[PDB]
Design an enzyme around this catalytic site. Structure first.
Site, PDB file in Angstrom:
ATOM      1  N   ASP B 107       0.799  -1.212   0.000  1.00  0.00           N
ATOM      2  CA  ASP B 107       0.000   0.000   0.000  1.00  0.00           C
ATOM      3  C   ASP B 107       0.828   1.256   0.000  1.00  0.00           C
ATOM      4  OD1 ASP B 107      -1.992  -1.885   0.327  1.00  0.00           O
ATOM      5  OD2 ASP B 107      -2.739  -1.060   2.200  1.00  0.00           O
ATOM      6  N   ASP B 191      -2.050   5.565  -3.229  1.00  0.00           N
ATOM      7  CA  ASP B 191      -1.559   4.395  -2.486  1.00  0.00           C
ATOM      8  C   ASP B 191      -0.797   3.669  -3.576  1.00  0.00           C
ATOM      9  OD1 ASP B 191      -3.124   5.151  -0.240  1.00  0.00           O
ATOM     10  OD2 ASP B 191      -3.891   3.149   0.105  1.00  0.00           O
ATOM     11  N   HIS B 240      -6.904   0.192  -4.362  1.00  0.00           N
ATOM     12  CA  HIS B 240      -5.968  -0.874  -4.733  1.00  0.00           C
ATOM     13  C   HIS B 240      -6.436  -1.727  -5.911  1.00  0.00           C
ATOM     14  CE1 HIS B 240      -4.993  -0.250  -0.216  1.00  0.00           C
ATOM     15  NE2 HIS B 240      -4.557   0.756  -0.948  1.00  0.00           N
ATOM     16  N   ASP B 242      -4.573  -4.744  -7.051  1.00  0.00           N
ATOM     17  CA  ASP B 242      -4.079  -6.118  -7.024  1.00  0.00           C
ATOM     18  C   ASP B 242      -4.998  -7.307  -6.694  1.00  0.00           C
ATOM     19  OD1 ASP B 242      -3.782  -4.881  -4.507  1.00  0.00           O
ATOM     20  OD2 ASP B 242      -1.979  -5.971  -4.035  1.00  0.00           O
ATOM     21  N   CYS B 344      -0.545  -8.049  -1.062  1.00  0.00           N
ATOM     22  CA  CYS B 344      -0.678  -6.902  -0.156  1.00  0.00           C
ATOM     23  C   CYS B 344       0.306  -6.900   1.012  1.00  0.00           C
ATOM     24  CB  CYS B 344      -2.084  -6.853   0.443  1.00  0.00           C
ATOM     25  SG  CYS B 344      -3.353  -6.665  -0.758  1.00  0.00           S
TER      26      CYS B 344
END
EC number: 2.1.4.1
Lengths: 360, 360
Positions: B107, B191, B240, B242, B344
């Protein structure tokens, strides 16, 4: 690009000029103590966390407004930081502090080419100084400029030598010669004013506020286009280089007679003209909370043949004039008290010229 | 250089793995509300500023320690952030807040080549998250790595739409499709996990935490060597990328069936293989304070033919195996609750390989 400045003397088109409003005396912590004259130590001890004398600040505001009027008259676009109350006490996970001011743009911002770089700073009271400049920087960013913020330190106790054995300025000089400063090499820290630009070559000094990790960070970030060289002086100024070694033209530098450069031969070998300015005439009775009487040579060049110089310092005005340099005299006697002269109170954003080498 | 990673799949040699210790529930401010499921809104309202359930945190610590043991067994050097109490309340001149955690290295940090970049973040509770990672970064810096910190936002009220009309996740999706997010374009914010790497091409999405100014900052900072492309998805993940579009090899990407990419044709035209993973089998009863059930596809590649995948998610394990990809099964069911899967909880620092183009 609105941002484009490779050195200290090309035709100035745009500049950021600081503010004296809401300036606060910083708490008397070790790093403040190591960057000020003993004479003022009790002033910091008593007035810490309070505004600088309001009658004094008002005179500085007046002097700076006039300086801006003159800049506009000389064809320069002036930008000012946002008004902010520096007395707010903030708290990070490492320390708590009140702020200082946004009087000296040179201490925090440096323009290298089309890039504006925000220095990390080394004083706890200057941790959030960048806030006054964000409106201007975002504007230049929207218009195409590159924007960089060097790594902000935690400024945890480990960055400082809490027990720095300084009982007077003579001690600091001795320690300085020993390679011992109030700041350690715990993490990178630096004030932009410890760097002075000459095209492809940038000069920096390791000072009380600029460590080797901070200089290496700049060196690594600017390479291969720019070379950052480290220079040192006798009885160095605690912080900042622009009242010790002020570069004023292609191959011409003002060298403070009281702080001779150890690597002066590198400049002589390159065929540079080293000029030693006449002594300052500022009254010893005038309060200079930071810096010294040498603010006289802290000049700002509008171009190679036009210098903004203190109206009171006649001897240095005469030196420039015998050199064919037009003197633009401005009085900032009360503004000096805050610790800066013309070069300190400004950050040249745009100068008309190209990237060149002068060291050959 | 200890730092060298150009993509998400080359042979992994070094990685940073996060910590679950002292994780704190963030105060329920507007940006938290816009990045979580309604189901959990009352948990944030009641527990804000307190540690996440300590019995839950203890199980995550156990699961993560085992993950690190497996990484070491697979030949990967593991670094961990410094232990820190995230409950400390800090105060900048713009706001006051308590912290979150250092559980998700993805992050905040992103490695592009030999450069480690610290993301500015967009949550007030994550303003000082970088502090847990400085010991590692300074170490890599001393060993030759480039280190960059994107401009840290003030995170003043102006950065947020205080009145973001979100009463449920369906509303956020509708607003998202309208180009309206809880964050404005007041200043850059982002982020690092909204960017995913494929050599010379990096993909980013404008999300609740990553604005266009933040993406443009990355684009401008990485050019000309790297090209940053903006992609969008249907019913995008609040923050995010991913667990929506996870690139797992040269020209192979996992595409979340519930969040199809609007620019999918750009990938098809380049001859990339788009794989849509089978649905997650994680119990609807299990608490996922952040993120969603799609953490199953939040895999980490050890190399092109070795993937670290959840021990519980058998269907996706079977997909990789029919593809000839060795599955390294690790259970991090309780660690998932904090909002992350393998991708993550890590930040790949060094992968064995060169800079290449896969989009051609």
């Amino acid at each position: 690009c609105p941002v484009s400045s490779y050195n200290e003397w090309d035709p100035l088109e745009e500049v950021i000029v600081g503010r004296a409003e809401n300036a606060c005396v910083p708490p008397f912590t070790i790093e403040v103590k190591a960057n000020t004259y003993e004479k003022y130590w009790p002033f910091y001890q008593k007035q810490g966390g309070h505004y600088f004398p309001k009658d004094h600040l008002k005179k500085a505001v007046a002097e700076i407004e006039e300086m801006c009027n003159i800049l506009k008259t000389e064809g320069v676009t002036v930008r000012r930081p946002d008004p902010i109350d520096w007395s707010l006490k903030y708290k990070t996970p490492d320390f708590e502090s009140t702020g200082l001011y946004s009087a000296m743009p040179r201490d925090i911002l440096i323009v290298v080419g089309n890039e504006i770089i925000e220095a990390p700073m080394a004083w706890r009271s200057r941790f959030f100084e960048y806030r006054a400049y964000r409106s201007i920087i975002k504007d230049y960013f929207h218009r195409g400029a590159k924007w960089t913020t060097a790594p902000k330190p935690t400024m945890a106790d480990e960055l400082y030598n809490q027990d720095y054995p300084i009982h007077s300025v003579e001690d600091r000089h001795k320690l300085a010669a020993q390679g011992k400063f109030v700041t350690t090499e715990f993490e990178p820290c630096f004030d932009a004013a410890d760097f002075i630009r000459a095209g492809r070559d940038i000069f920096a000094q390791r000072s009380q506020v600029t460590n080797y990790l901070g200089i290496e960070w700049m060196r690594r970030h600017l390479a291969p286009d720019y070379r950052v060289h480290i220079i040192s002086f006798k009885d160095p100024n605690p912080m900042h280089i622009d009242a010790t070694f002020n570069i004023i033209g292609p191959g011409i530098v003002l060298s403070n007679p009281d702080r001779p450069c150890h690597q002066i031969d590198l400049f002589k070998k390159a065929g540079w003209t080293i000029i030693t300015p006449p002594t300052p005439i500022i009254p010893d009775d005038h309060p200079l909370w930071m810096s010294s009487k040498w603010l006289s040579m802290n000049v700002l060049m509008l171009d190679e043949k036009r210098v903004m110089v203190d109206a009171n310092e006649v001897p240095i005005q005469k030196m420039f004039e015998k050199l064919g340099i037009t003197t633009i005299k401005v009085n900032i006697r009360n503004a000096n008290s805050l610790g800066g002269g013309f070069h300190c109170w400004t950050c040249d954003v745009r100068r008309r010229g190209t990237l060149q080498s002068y060291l050959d």
